[PDB]
């Protein structure tokens, strides 16, 4: 582990935690 890698880790959680809702609504409201 390290400081740099640690910064990227959380980045994935914050990006995913929010992304999960993206496709969740985008797909649910599909054409």
From Swiss-Prot:
Disulfide bonds: none annotated. Residues 2-15 have a biased composition (Basic and acidic residues). Plays a role in the regulation of memory formation and depression-related behaviors potentially by influencing synaptic plasticity and neurogenesis. Induces acute and transient activation of the NTRK2/TRKB receptor and subsequent CREB phosphorylation. Also induces insulin secretion in insulinoma cells by increasing intracellular calcium mobilization. This is VGF-derived peptide TLQP-62. It comes from Homo sapiens (Human). The chain holds residues 586 to 615 of 615 of the full protein.
